[PDB]
């Protein structure tokens with residue numbers, strides 16, 4: 001439960017097999033978050049535990065905070081960029 | 096940090112390649128703990144995180160609490176039985 005908001009970060013490029021989605025992500029990635037919520041304490045915790053929690057709390061926060069925006073495509077792309085940033089954030093933490 | 100002492104449990108049989116250790120464990124397993132410390136909250140946490148923590152806290156507790164007993168052999172056997180019981184304890188928790 002002891003989580004913080006991490007610093008803004010470069011959005012990673014996510015790849016898709018479908019040409020449409022692959023290009024859609026590139027053209028729309030500015031619409032997604034560029035920071036994530038995690039637990040500093042998820043330290044030396046294993047990566048999967050940290051990322052599991054970071055993804056859950058981060059997506060939850062964006063649901064609430066977002067008081068015609070997103071479609072099914074955007075939701076899943078947002079989830080993937082959030083996961084990658086959580087992994088990056090865990091590397092930041094490791095030592 | 097929110098950990099509990101779990102209920103006593105049947106000691107699992109641990110196996111060794113060395114005939115001496117394999118039999119030593121069987122003849123001396125009564126000398127080791129038969130319960131472990133864990134975090135109920137390490138729930139739906141992944142198994143490795145739960146067991147990582149359970150093993151660490153459990154062995155730490157036995158160090159303190161133990162105010163000519165154990166040798167190098169006993170220490171490592173104790174660690175292995177503790178790990179197995181932590182895994183059992185995590186299965187108890189899973190749902």
Ligand SMILES: [Cl-]
Nearest residue numbers: 046048141143
């Ligand atoms: Cl893992």
